[PDB]
Design a protein around this ligand. Sequence first.
Ligand SMILES: *[C@@H]1O[C@H](CO)[C@@H](O)[C@H](O[C@@H]2O[C@H](CO)[C@@H](O[C@@H]3O[C@H](CO[C@H]4O[C@H](CO)[C@@H](O)[C@H](O)[C@@H]4O)[C@@H](O)[C@H](O[C@H]4O[C@H](CO)[C@@H](O)[C@H](O)[C@@H]4O)[C@@H]3O)[C@H](O)[C@H]2NC(C)=O)[C@H]1NC(C)=O
Ligand SMILES: *[C@@H]1O[C@H](CO)[C@@H](O[C@@H]2O[C@H](CO)[C@@H](O[C@@H]3O[C@H](CO[C@H]4O[C@H](CO)[C@@H](O)[C@H](O)[C@@H]4O)[C@@H](O)[C@H](O[C@H]4O[C@H](CO)[C@@H](O)[C@H](O)[C@@H]4O)[C@@H]3O)[C@H](O)[C@H]2NC(C)=O)[C@H](O)[C@H]1NC(C)=O
Ligand SMILES: *[C@@H]1O[C@H](CO)[C@@H](O[C@@H]2O[C@H](CO)[C@@H](O[C@@H]3O[C@H](CO)[C@@H](O)[C@H](O)[C@@H]3O)[C@H](O)[C@H]2NC(C)=O)[C@H](O)[C@H]1NC(C)=O
Ligand SMILES: *[C@@H]1O[C@H](CO)[C@@H](O[C@@H]2O[C@H](CO)[C@@H](O)[C@H](O)[C@H]2NC(C)=O)[C@H](O)[C@H]1NC(C)=O
Ligand SMILES: *[C@@H]1O[C@H](CO)[C@@H](O[C@@H]2O[C@H](CO)[C@@H](O)[C@H](O)[C@H]2NC(C)=O)[C@H](O)[C@H]1NC(C)=O
Ligand SMILES: *[C@@H]1O[C@H](CO)[C@@H](O[C@@H]2O[C@H](CO)[C@@H](O)[C@H](O)[C@H]2NC(C)=O)[C@H](O)[C@H]1NC(C)=O
Ligand SMILES: *[C@@H]1O[C@H](CO)[C@@H](O[C@@H]2O[C@H](CO)[C@@H](O)[C@H](O)[C@H]2NC(C)=O)[C@H](O)[C@H]1NC(C)=O
Ligand SMILES: *[C@@H]1O[C@H](CO)[C@@H](O[C@@H]2O[C@H](CO)[C@@H](O)[C@H](O)[C@H]2NC(C)=O)[C@H](O)[C@H]1NC(C)=O
Ligand SMILES: *[C@@H]1O[C@H](CO)[C@@H](O)[C@H](O)[C@H]1NC(C)=O
Ligand SMILES: *[C@@H]1O[C@H](CO)[C@@H](O)[C@H](O)[C@H]1NC(C)=O
Ligand SMILES: *[C@@H]1O[C@H](CO)[C@@H](O)[C@H](O)[C@H]1NC(C)=O
Ligand SMILES: *[C@@H]1O[C@H](CO)[C@@H](O)[C@H](O)[C@H]1NC(C)=O
Ligand SMILES: [Ca+2]
Ligand SMILES: [Ca+2]
Ligand code: NI
Lengths: 636, 141, 71, 71, 5, 424, 5, 6
Amino acid sequence: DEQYEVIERVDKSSGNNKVVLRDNVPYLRGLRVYHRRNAADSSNGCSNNPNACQQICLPVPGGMFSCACASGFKLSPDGRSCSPYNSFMVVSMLPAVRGFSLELSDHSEAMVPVAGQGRNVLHADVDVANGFIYWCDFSSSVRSSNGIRRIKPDGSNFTNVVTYGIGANGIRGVALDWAAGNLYFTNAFVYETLIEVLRINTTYRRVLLKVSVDMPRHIIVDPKHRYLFWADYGQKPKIERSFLDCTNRTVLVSEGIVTPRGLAMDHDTGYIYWVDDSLDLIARIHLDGGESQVVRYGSRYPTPYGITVFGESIIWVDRNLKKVFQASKQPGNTDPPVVIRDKINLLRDVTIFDEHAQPLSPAELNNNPCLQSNGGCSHFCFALPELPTPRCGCAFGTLGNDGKSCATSQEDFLIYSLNNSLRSLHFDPRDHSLPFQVISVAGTAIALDYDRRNNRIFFTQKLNSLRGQISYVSLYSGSSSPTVLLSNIGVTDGIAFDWINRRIYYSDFSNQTINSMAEDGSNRAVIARVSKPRAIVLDPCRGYMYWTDWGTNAKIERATLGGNFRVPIVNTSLVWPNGLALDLETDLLYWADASLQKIERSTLTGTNREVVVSTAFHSFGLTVYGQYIYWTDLYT
Amino acid sequence: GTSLKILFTGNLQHLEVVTLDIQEQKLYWAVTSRGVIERGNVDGTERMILVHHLAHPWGLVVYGSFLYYSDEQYEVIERVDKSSGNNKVVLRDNVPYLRGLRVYHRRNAADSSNGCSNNPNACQQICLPVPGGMFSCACAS
Amino acid sequence: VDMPRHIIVDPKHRYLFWADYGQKPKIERSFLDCTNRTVLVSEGIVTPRGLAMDHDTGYIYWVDDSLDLIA
Amino acid sequence: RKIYRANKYDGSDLVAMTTRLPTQPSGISTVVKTQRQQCSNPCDQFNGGCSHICAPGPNGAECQCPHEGNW
Amino acid sequence: XXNXX
Amino acid sequence: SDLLQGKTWSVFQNGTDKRVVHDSGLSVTEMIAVDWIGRNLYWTDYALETIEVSKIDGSHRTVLISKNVTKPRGLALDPRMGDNVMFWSDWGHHPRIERASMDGTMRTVIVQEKIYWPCGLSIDYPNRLIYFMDAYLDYIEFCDYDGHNRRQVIASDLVLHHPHALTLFEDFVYWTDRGTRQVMQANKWHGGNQSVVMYSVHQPLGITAIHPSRQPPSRNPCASASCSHLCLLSAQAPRHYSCACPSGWNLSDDSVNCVRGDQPFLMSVRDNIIFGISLDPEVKSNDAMVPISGIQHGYDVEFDDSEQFIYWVENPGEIHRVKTDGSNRTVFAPLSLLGSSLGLALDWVSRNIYYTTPASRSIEVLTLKGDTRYGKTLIANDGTPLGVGFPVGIAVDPARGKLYWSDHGTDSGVPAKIASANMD
Amino acid sequence: XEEXX
Amino acid sequence: XXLXXX
Ligand SMILES: *[C@@H]1O[C@H](CO)[C@@H](O)[C@H](O[C@@H]2O[C@H](CO)[C@@H](O[C@@H]3O[C@H](CO[C@H]4O[C@H](CO)[C@@H](O)[C@H](O)[C@@H]4O)[C@@H](O)[C@H](O[C@H]4O[C@H](CO)[C@@H](O)[C@H](O)[C@@H]4O)[C@@H]3O)[C@H](O)[C@H]2NC(C)=O)[C@H]1NC(C)=O
Ligand SMILES: *[C@@H]1O[C@H](CO)[C@@H](O[C@@H]2O[C@H](CO)[C@@H](O[C@@H]3O[C@H](CO[C@H]4O[C@H](CO)[C@@H](O)[C@H](O)[C@@H]4O)[C@@H](O)[C@H](O[C@H]4O[C@H](CO)[C@@H](O)[C@H](O)[C@@H]4O)[C@@H]3O)[C@H](O)[C@H]2NC(C)=O)[C@H](O)[C@H]1NC(C)=O
Ligand SMILES: *[C@@H]1O[C@H](CO)[C@@H](O[C@@H]2O[C@H](CO)[C@@H](O[C@@H]3O[C@H](CO)[C@@H](O)[C@H](O)[C@@H]3O)[C@H](O)[C@H]2NC(C)=O)[C@H](O)[C@H]1NC(C)=O
Ligand SMILES: *[C@@H]1O[C@H](CO)[C@@H](O[C@@H]2O[C@H](CO)[C@@H](O)[C@H](O)[C@H]2NC(C)=O)[C@H](O)[C@H]1NC(C)=O
Ligand SMILES: *[C@@H]1O[C@H](CO)[C@@H](O[C@@H]2O[C@H](CO)[C@@H](O)[C@H](O)[C@H]2NC(C)=O)[C@H](O)[C@H]1NC(C)=O
Ligand SMILES: *[C@@H]1O[C@H](CO)[C@@H](O[C@@H]2O[C@H](CO)[C@@H](O)[C@H](O)[C@H]2NC(C)=O)[C@H](O)[C@H]1NC(C)=O
Ligand SMILES: *[C@@H]1O[C@H](CO)[C@@H](O[C@@H]2O[C@H](CO)[C@@H](O)[C@H](O)[C@H]2NC(C)=O)[C@H](O)[C@H]1NC(C)=O
Ligand SMILES: *[C@@H]1O[C@H](CO)[C@@H](O[C@@H]2O[C@H](CO)[C@@H](O)[C@H](O)[C@H]2NC(C)=O)[C@H](O)[C@H]1NC(C)=O
Ligand SMILES: *[C@@H]1O[C@H](CO)[C@@H](O)[C@H](O)[C@H]1NC(C)=O
Ligand SMILES: *[C@@H]1O[C@H](CO)[C@@H](O)[C@H](O)[C@H]1NC(C)=O
Ligand SMILES: *[C@@H]1O[C@H](CO)[C@@H](O)[C@H](O)[C@H]1NC(C)=O
Ligand SMILES: *[C@@H]1O[C@H](CO)[C@@H](O)[C@H](O)[C@H]1NC(C)=O
Ligand SMILES: [Ca+2]
Ligand SMILES: [Ca+2]
Ligand code: NI
C-alpha cells in the first residue's frame, strides 16, 4: 500500500491473519515472488514443438499452438513462414507513421512504425512496386527537420529524398507517380506556393507552377487518366485539375467548399473524393466535373482530415474524434461508420498500400507511355490525356530538336552567385526551366562576369576573412571543374571582363585597390588605390571604366582603362553604392545605394540623375538587359 | 444542507452537469465515459438512457418540450425532444470550446413561493428553504 | 546539540514541554523560564512532531510518524 | 554576521556570542564602570602653556593648531 | 545587416 | 565510485587500464576501504543503509552489517592479523563510531559522546589510533581502538566549516572541506602548521594518500583457507578468518562450503530501486538478491528462473535485464517506438514476454529465446468494448494458453474491466 | 503555417 | 551545506 507505506501478508482465502513485512517504505510499487517455476511441470504446444514457427510461437487453449510474425510480417499459407505485408493502410499522424491490416480482425502492426526524434509527419504516400513509404516532416523552427524522407515498410534503407529549397511553410503534400517514377510535391512559402517534380533516384528536379493568390496544399496523381489534382484552402477554396505538367489548369469544385484538406482517387469509377472540415461532409465528384455528390454529412463528422478509397468503401481519419473510420463509398448510404482504430492523437492522413491501388500492366494504365523506359525521354516524361507520345520535360537546359534530349540553353539569361554555387535564371518570369545545371565551387562566389568568345564565367571566390581568389568555368557541352586563375588575393567584391583588350579587372576590398590582368592570369597591374571598392563596369569602345566607392566619402568615379584621369562622376547623397551597371543600348549608368535603399539612372558624367525605383531594400549586384534591370537583394 | 441522500450510483464515470426539469420533477445528466444522457426521477427511480453515441457532452438544459445539449467534440449545439430523444436538430455547429448551457426566461417567484419568500426579514443573515414550505435560518462562515 | 521544535505551555502546572526529533530525540520538560530542564521520554522516540495535554489529567500526548505511534 | 571571543593569550575557547545577526555587525567596545588608568594631565594646568589646543605627550603637553587656517 | 558579402 | 553512473572503477596509478569492479546495485557509495591482506573490498552505502564486502575483483558481494545502520559514512580497516578490526561512522539518530571485527561478529560502539554528524575515518597504523572528524561540532579527534584516550587535534577553530574525508601520512593530517571547497594540511598532533594543499572548483569529497607505509604488510591467515566464495579476516580465535558467501547462499554445516538458496523471496519494486526481501517477516535484512539501483520509473518487475535473470522496463521504451548476482546488467531489446510500457508478464514455458503500452494502447509480445528479437502487437484499441482501452496489469497462464489484463475505460469505447484472451 | 505541434 | 552527499 503506497499511502500506508507498508508491505503486508494475508491469507489467500480471507483477509484474516494480517502480517507486516516492512513499514515506513516510501514510493512502494509492484510486487512479485521469485520462486522455482518449473518449465517441465507446466507444458504447452510451443514447448512440445520447439523451432516449429519461424519467428514467434504463441500457445492456445487445448495444448495447441499458433505461429506469429514480427511487426510488418504475416504468416504464409503454410502456417510456419513469414512474408512482408502486401495489403495494408498507411495512417500518418504528427508523432508517427503506422500501418494497419485492411481486415479489421488482425490488430498486428502491418509496418514497422516510423517514429522517434524529428518526426512531425504531415502527409504520406506509398510506392508499392519498390516497397517504399514517402512522408514529409515539417518544423517551423528547425530548418533541418523539413523535407521528404522514405523508408521500407520493414524499417530498413532510411533515406532523405528532398532536403534543399523547402519554404518556410514546408512541404504541404506529396504524390508519387508510380508509372513514371515522378514524385510531385507542393513547396509552400510565406506568400507563394510551388509545385515541383523529382524523378526518384535522380538529381533532376524542376518547378512546374508558381502561384501567389492560389495555394495548392494536398495533391494526388492519376497515371491512368494522366491528370493531377490538388486541394486549395486559401482565400478562394477550390479543387483543381491539370495535366501531369501543370499546364491545363481547370477548377472541378469552386462553390460549397471551404478548407478541403484531403483528396482521394477511385481509379475504377473515376470519382474524386474529398473531406471538408469546415462544412463537416465527405463528397465526391467525377473527373469531367459534374454535380458534387454528398457521401457523408452532419454533426457526427466534425474534422475529417484525410481520406482514401479501397474497393467498395472509403476510409477517413478524424482529428477531433481520434478515430479511423470505414464506410460505404456510395452516396446516400446510412450504415454507421465502422471504427478501425481509436484514441489516436494528431491524426493527419490515411493511404492504401496495395498492388490494386497502383497497377502496372499497360492494360490497366491505358498504355501509359512512361512505363517502357521513361518514354525514352532524357529527364522527365509527362504522359497527356489522349496523345500516345509523351511530352518531354527538361530539368535543366533546353529540349533538343529530336524532342527527347536536353542540352545547355543557347538563349540569353541571368547568372548569379549563391554562396558555394553559381546559379542560372531565365529572363522570362513564368519560365521555370534552368538554362544550365548549377555549378558547385569551393568557398563562396561573390562577383561574376561572362566571356562570350570562350563561353566562360569568371567569378571571384572568398575562402576566409582575408583569403580570396579568382576562378573560371566553361559552359561548353560536357563538364569541367572550376579552375583557379590567380590565388593569394584578399576578399574581392567585384569583377569585369574587357571583351576588346581581353583583360580582367577586379576590386580587392582587403588591399583597397583596383587591379587588372590578362585573361590567362598573367600581366597583373594596379589601376587605382580606393578605400572599400565594390563594383566595376567597362566601356572599352570609349576607353572609360567606372567603379563604386562605399563608406567614408562614398562616390561613383570614372577613369580610363589605364587609370590616369580619375574624376568623380557622382558624390552627392550616396552611402553604400553596392551595385553598378551600364546600359550600352541607351548610354545610361545605373547604380544601387543599399543604405539609401534606391536604384538611380543618369547620363554618363551624372547629368539628369533620377530614381528608377525607390525602396530597393539592400541591393548587392545589378544588371540591365532588354527593357528591364535585375538586382540581388541581401535583406529579402 | 441537511438530509443528504444518494439517488443514482453505478456507471457514472466522468459525470457532467446535472440539470432539473422542475415541472416534470426529473433529473437529466450526461456521462462522458459512456457518451450518453440519462434521465431519472428525483426520488431515485426510473433511471434510463435518453440520448447516446455522444462524444463529450458538456452543457445540458431542459426547457419547454425540449432538451438542449452542447457536445464539445462534434463542436455542436443540438436540440432533441425530452420524450425518448427523437427529432434531433442542430442549432449551431463548428463552435470551438463549447461549455455549459442555460435558457434565460422569465420566472415568476410569486407562483413558486417558499418559506423564505413567505417570511422576509425572518433570518438575520441567511434564509434557506426547507421541504414542506418551512425555512431554516443560517449564519455566514 | 538539542533542537526544540514543537513547544507547548501549561499555566496550570507551570511548565514548558517541547519535542526534539533531532540527533537525540526526546520530549523535554522545564519551568516557564526554560530553567530546570528534564527529559520525560528518550526511549522509543525518533520523530515527535506534535505535543498535546489534557488539563484535567496531566498526560502529555505526542505523535511520531517514524514509529507510526500515538503515545 | 556574529560576534566571537577567544582567550587573549592563545585563542582558545573560541565561541560565538551571537546568532547570525540580520545586518553585518561593525564596531565594538566595552562599557566599564571602574575608572581606567589615571595620570596627571599637564594641559589641566594653565592649558600646558599652549595658545590653543593641547594633549599630554610622552614627556609633556604638546601644543596644536586648529583645523582651519594656516599656522 | 552590416554591409559585407 | 561514480555516484551518477552507480559503478565502482579501478585504474593503475599511471592512468592506464581503467576497468569496472561493481557495475550495478550501488546507490550512494560514501567511502571505500580495500583489504590489502585478505584481498577483500569494503564499502558503505548511504541509501541501502548497509556495510557491504566483496572480493577485490568485485566477484562475490554480500551484506556484512545491517542491524542499526542508519546513515553509514566513514569506514577504516586494520587487516593486520593482531588487530583484524573494522571501524565505521553513522550520523543517523544517536550518532556513533562503531568497532567490529571484519566479518562483523565482535560489534561494539566506541564513541557516542559529544558527537553530531560524524564524517570520515582513518587509522594511524603504528600507534593504532582511529582519527575521526565532525561536520556539525567542527573538530578533528583521535582515540584508541576501544574509544579510550580521546584527544583533540583541531577543536574550537573557525578553519573547519564542513570537513568530509580524512588522510594521514607521517606526522601530517590532510582533510577535504566541502564548505571552503579546499583540501588542507596540518600537524596530526596539535593542528599547528596549517596550509591549503589546493583549491577545488567543486566540493572535494574523497581523499587518500598513495604510499606503501599506508598499507603495512602482514602474514595472511586466509592463504591456507579452503573457503568457497568469500573468506574474511577475523579478530576472533587463533584461525583469524571466517568463511562467508554472497547474498542468496546458505552457510553449510561444514563451515567452508556454501549452497545457493533455492527458497523463494519477494521482489519489492520501488520508484528508483528493486529490492529482494525474505518472505519471513522477522528477517529485515533486504539482501535476498543484489538490489537493482538506478531505476527511472519502476512499476513492474519480472524474472526468469532459468539463467536467473530479472527483467524491467525503462522510460525511453526499452527492456533491461540483470542476474540476481548483478553480473550481466544490459539493455535487452528495444520494446516499442510509440511510448513506454507499463505491465510485464513472462511466459517461462515458451520463453516469451508480454507487456502493455498504454501510450500505444496495445498488448504486445516479445521473444527472448533466439539471438534475434521479434516483437508483435496482439490486442489493439478497436471500436468494440472487447479491445484494449488502457491496459494496466497483465497475467499469463502458459499451461492453458490464457492471458488476463486489467483495463481502464475509454470514452464511448471500452469499459473498465478485467479481460481474458488467448496468448495469441 | 497550420500544424507545428 | 547539508551533510547528504547527493
Ligand atoms: C531507387 O533506389 C532505391 C535505393 O534503395 C532502390 O530501393 C530502388 O531499387 C529497387 O527497386 C526494385 C523494384 O523491383 C526492388 O526489387 C524488388 O525486390 C523485391 C524484394 O525482394 C526480396 O524478397 C523476395 C521475396 O521472394 C526475395 O526473393 C528477394 O531475394 C528479396 O529478399 C522482389 O520481390 C522483386 O522481385 C520482382 O522483380 C524481379 C526483377 O528481377 C523478379 O526477378 C522477381 O521475379 C519479381 O518479379 C524485386 O527484385 C528493390 O527491392 C529496390 N531496391 C531495394 C534495395 O529495395 C530504386 N527504384 C525506385 C525508382 O524506387
Ligand atoms: C538457506 O536458508 C534458508 C533460510 O533458512 C532456507 O529457507 C527455508 O527452506 C525451508 C525448506 O524449503 C522452508 O520450509 C518450507 O516452508 C514452506 C512455507 O513457509 C512456511 O515456513 C515459513 C518459515 O517459518 C513461514 O514464514 C511461512 O508462513 C510458512 O509457515 C512450507 O510450506 C514447507 O512445508 C512443507 O515441507 C515441510 C518439511 O520441510 C513439511 O513438514 C510440510 O508438510 C510441507 O510439505 C516448508 O516448511 C522455509 O520456509 C525456508 N525459509 C525461508 C526463509 O524461506 C533454505 O532452504 C536454505 N537453502 C537450502 C537449499 O537449504
Ligand atoms: C602502468 O603501470 C602498469 C603497472 O606497472 C604497467 O602494466 C604492466 O605492469 C607490469 C608489472 O609487472 C609489467 O611487467 C610485466 O609483468 C608480468 C607479470 O606476470 C610479466 O609476465 C611481464 O614479463 C612483465 O614483466 C608489464 O610489462 C606492464 N604492461 C605493459 C603493457 O608493459 C603499464 O605498462 C604502465 N603503463 C605505462 C603507460 O607505463
Ligand atoms: C555555404 O557555403 C559553405 C562553403 O563556403 C558551405 O560549407 C559549410 O560552411 C559551414 C560554415 O558556414 C561549415 O560549418 C561547414 O562545415 C561547411 N561544410 C558543409 C558542406 O556544410 C555551406 O554548406 C553553404 N551553405 C548553404 C546553406 O548554402
Ligand atoms: C564632388 O564632385 C564635384 C564635381 O562634380 C567636385 O567639385 C569640384 O571640385 C574640384 C576640387 O579641386 C574643383 O576644382 C572644381 O571646381 C569642382 N567643380 C564643381 C563643379 O564644383 C567636388 O569637389 C567633389 N567633392 C565633394 C564632396 O563635393
Ligand atoms: C540494535 O538496536 C536495538 C535498539 O536500540 C538494540 O536493543 C537494545 O539494546 C540495549 C543494550 O545495548 C538494551 O538495553 C535495550 O533494551 C535494547 N532495546 C530494545 C528495544 O531492544 C540492539 O542491541 C542493537 N543490536 C545490535 C545488533 O547492535
Ligand atoms: C608550527 O611550526 C613552527 C615552526 O615553523 C613550530 O614552532 C615552535 O613550536 C614550539 C612549541 O609550540 C614553540 O614553543 C616555539 O617557540 C616555536 N619555535 C619558533 C622558532 O617559533 C610549531 O611547533 C608548529 N606548531 C605550532 C603549534 O605552532
Ligand atoms: C555475462 O557476462 C559475462 C562477463 O562479461 C560474459 O562472459 C564473457 O563472454 C565473452 C563473450 O563470449 C567472453 O569473451 C568472455 O571471456 C566471458 N567472460 C567470462 C568471465 O566468462 C557472459 O557471456 C554474459 N552472459 C550473458 C548471457 O549475458
Ligand atoms: C538497404 O538495406 C540493406 C540492409 O540493411 C543494405 O545492405 C543495403 O546496402 C541498403 N541499400 C542502400 C541503397 O542503402
Ligand atoms: C486544355 O487546353 C487545350 C489546348 O491544349 C484546350 O483545347 C482545352 O479546351 C483545355 N481543356 C479544357 C477542359 O478546357
Ligand atoms: C596586397 O598589396 C601588396 C602590396 O602592398 C601586395 O604585395 C600583395 O600581394 C597584395 N595582396 C595581399 C592580400 O597582401
Ligand atoms: C530544580 O533545580 C535544582 C538546582 O539545579 C535541582 O536541585 C532540583 O532538583 C530541580 N527541580 C526541582 C523540582 O526543584
Ligand atoms: Ca468542423
Ligand atoms: Ca559545520
Ligand atoms: Ni467533461
